[model samples]
Target chain A: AMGSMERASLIQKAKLAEQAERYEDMAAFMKGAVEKGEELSCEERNLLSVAYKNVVGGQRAAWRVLSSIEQKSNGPEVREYREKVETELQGVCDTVLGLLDSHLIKEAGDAESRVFYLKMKGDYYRYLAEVATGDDKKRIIDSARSAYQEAMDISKKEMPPTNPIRLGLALNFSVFHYEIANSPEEAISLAKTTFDEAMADLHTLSEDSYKDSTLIMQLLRDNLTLWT
Target chain B: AMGSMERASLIQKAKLAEQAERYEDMAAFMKGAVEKGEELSCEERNLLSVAYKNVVGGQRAAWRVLSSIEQKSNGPEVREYREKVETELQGVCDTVLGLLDSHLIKEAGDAESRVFYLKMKGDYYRYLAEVATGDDKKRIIDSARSAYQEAMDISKKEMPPTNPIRLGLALNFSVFHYEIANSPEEAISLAKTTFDEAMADLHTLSEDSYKDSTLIMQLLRDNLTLWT
Candidate 1:
């Protein structure tokens, strides 16, 4: 456990940052509260992880934009900051990857852990996509494209019609196509394909509240036209 | 332009709502700020649309839960409220869908859309799967299942790589499979496939800074073992 004073200070800073809409800063402050150097408990670290994940995940769009640039080309001052961010991201990825690998090879993984893992992976790809450029960008994009395809294939093999998980894959694939595809035409074409599939699903299932169905349909349509 | 006092009030309320993390309320408050009862200027509408979309779009988990319910249930209390939400959602969908149909029909009708559509539908089915006894549940589940498959098929036909859209779709399908499949074993199997495919995507891509991939992989494994 952290001392009352330390905990109070951390909470105050976090609340202030959150109030200011500085989500990244809030995450940083929370992380610092329980970092290795901080005098805190395992419980505090767990709580910090939650704060870090929530705040960081909410800033996906910003990260996506940042990842699109060539960090080194921005000059020394910018590059230094970029390098620092990159190093931090790499550390995160390693920790997550190790956890995932160990989960399979070992047997300590559980539902809570798995949920945390998925959230982590989501953040990782988002961040990776954020700081990528040149060959690095290309590699990540190409790999992402390939991974999307693989996910699509596996879902088809395993499940039958109207599966929600399968549908989510299609939607996410479309987003990537929109953001990372090499060509506009490719993005447009893929967007159409994904959107239509999502629409068809909407029509078949009357169980979704009208609002939900509409939202999904709209999302599909919006992405379809984003490039145009 | 418009009355300064009205604009200030609206802006103030919207800001307060956002600060409270009440995104939907913020959107609603902002809506009143600009609409002024009459038709909005193109610029005003576009700005509002952007704000509305951002607020609604990001509430993915909320939508997920609401959409997962069966709308046709015989509930007296929830029926009206559900219908209201559904209608509002449809309004949003119509606004976006018309644009897609006119300009981006190809993309709108693509696999990604279909997948997104079906996943939302699947969630609806899951909500109804428990409520509709016997034949009704079967029908709903069957429809949901079909939509899932169609979405998956389209993904295979189009972008079949490690793309975000495809992986996201896969994750959605896996969740559905685990939740609504006929048996626990079936659900676990589908979850396993989802985890594997998703993990593969993670491997080829860099790690996320916000969440952990390893945790997701471990969750999938644990879920599979539960079936055993």
Candidate 2:
């Protein structure tokens, strides 16, 4: 067993490592001190969890530590730390969703801007589906589809027929169908319809004209080929 | 010469290209329309400059286009557009300097945070020196050296002995001297002193204890070896 003086020295070194942003070293020292029966304060435990998250990239392990602390601690600081850890675990999902919600609220009446927000919300849900499990995964996938459908409905009603924005929207929505919905047939059909409409519009314009529309049409065709 | 119908078609295609974010296609169409004696509106001229900036990657070319419009037009919109272009050309230089200035204002008494801002300012000046030429390049290089010296002066006065933050500041400051100032001897001497001091401190701590310090010492030694 280590003496009090030795334990104090280890703790001080760990604090120095934390200050230097040597998170891996900080974590190793703290864990070793704990193994040697050194008592850690609540703040030190929180710091250890942060070190685990930063250096080891072990969110689950960090959460395990924080959740254990939550069960025992009644302090406001612990509550705030727990909330921070939860936000970190949610990662990009919370960030994108928050942006989407804010934009939707700000641009409630603007159909064009609303379409953008809906598409971003769709992307956020799709990303969540990738990270979630079981029933949560299925629910998130459904949410992604609904968001895409909402965007499509608004865009079809408001945007001009020849607008290339619809082409991008269709391509992304088709991807969600193929990858997340596992509806390859529906994805292929939707892509084919969009491509045919785009090519039909291109046929009406001069060969030298509408070069941008032609480029978008070629990209749409290429993306459809990926599905087939 | 193209007829009015052809000119109108070209203008429409340019608008579509801009919407599709195909800056190359937009520039090509707009230039073709201009060559065929199609007169552009103020907004089209602004779009043309944007296309030049995005596709040609030449801020000077874009500025030339905008300045020409500025000479001919006195509209508020054109003035706002010109100001936006000017800000974009300033790029990362303005961004880092603005951040450094704000941090200086906010933390007038905090030397540690001030050192961080000073290092970033130094890095910004070094980056500017990389892209600038002649008198401008020399001026920026001198500015970087001044910022680094300021950081060093503050750190030396305020920080405790054997603080790893000082080691980091010295390592980066040594790099600036070696790379920017072309002062190899001074750089080498500074790195050697910091490394020796860190090693002496590590010798006092137990091998099993102060593991974090051992890690930092190893890193400092490695960095010094790179310089030697």
Candidate 3:
């Protein structure tokens, strides 16, 4: 049905699929929109990001489980199954990474939107790192870390200390440092400073971002607490 | 893997499928076991019931959403969709109802197992009534009410009030009264009495049924609390 849809209907269809909690289908609809040269609004881009996040997130989660089982047993059956899981995980990451690189980030009209796409790029690369081995692992991890660093630096200058995009970037980037980079001290330092700066500028935070910004601040504090 | 397995491997496969949360596949494996005239132990029968529960329960939940939409706007597309939903729902119920009627109940060596099958029969009938109209509705609703009564009677005579099966039957039967039969008085009375009786015999509850029994009692109490 979506194969025949124009941009408006495709965007609407993706939103409806979001409400339906059918992320894989939503991703397909948005991916179709991307393939046909339809442009994304800020809303459209966020929707597309969420769609890809859930779609790829689901496969990575399954890969995590299969990876665990294969590691535990060291059997041919479990190993073969995990291989398929990794292949599928890599495939989804390839798709959205291409989507982000070719279209979304390039079309960003504002700093916040640019930060959002860069953050998303880093996040998907982190997911790919979960399944990659040897040179592939290092390459994907470097991609994730570099994108997150670029996003954070740009967000610091272009957005406010209490900005939601900046704060979200800090949170996810710290997690990448902790989980993917195995640099707990770096993770803790980033999380603590982000929380401290946001709280110091807390009163200037507007009514619109009060809930969201404060929520991400709490996540930053939580990670610092746990990591330290 | 399952098609080639004899009864033992088939059973093990079904168990693994359950762990993997693949209820539809579990049902298929169990259904295949039934077609080959494999006699089920009590445990096998219970696992099969759970498999059917998740499979048919999913469709009914979806049917409920479609039914609501069809009722509100009265469109041909949504109406046609709900029709397909109803058809598939009836098909699954038919499969399980036959499985229960022919094999499970007859092979029940004790009152608890027999009551289990009867309660399941009543439960599935209530599900069918949700989508049925006119004669079909009356027949199914009546079938559900009757089987529920029969199960309640046998349970009272042979099983302890604190018995998990008996308590589960009471909870579901009370719901049938409230939702399907539109008799709130009967629903409230049954829930209250069942809870009252079980609590009175609380000291006599065995170690095994302690957790399961009290958990269901909480549900029974919850319904009464909310409705009142």
Which candidate achieves the best TM-score against the true structure?
3
Cα lDDT for residue A187, candidate 2: 85
Identify the leading candidate in terms of DockQ: 3
Candidate 2 chain A weakest lDDT stretch, 10 residues? A1-10
lDDT of 1 by residue, B1-228 (tens): 223336545555454444434455455555566444433333343344445556545333333434344343423323432343445544544444333233332334555555554454454444445334577668877866775676677776775434444545555566667667655556666676766666556645555611455555565666667656
Report the CA-based lDDT of candidate 1 relative to the real structure: 0.50
- Model 1, A169-188: lDDT tens digits are 55566667656664556666
Considering only N, C-alpha and C atoms within 3 Å, which residue pairs clash in candidate 3?
A: none
What TM-score does model 1 score on chain A? Answer: 0.54
DockQ class, candidate 1 = incorrect
Error of 2 at B65 (Å): 18
- TM of chain B vs. native, candidate 1: 0.48
Candidate 3: tens digits of C-alpha lDDT, residues A54-131 = 877766666666666657765244465457557877888888889888887887768878888899899989988877
TM-score of 3: 0.73
Top candidate, metric lDDT: 3
Question: What DockQ results do all the predictions give, each relative to the true complex?
Answer: 0.01, 0.01, 0.13
Estimate TM-scores for all models. 0.33, 0.35, 0.73
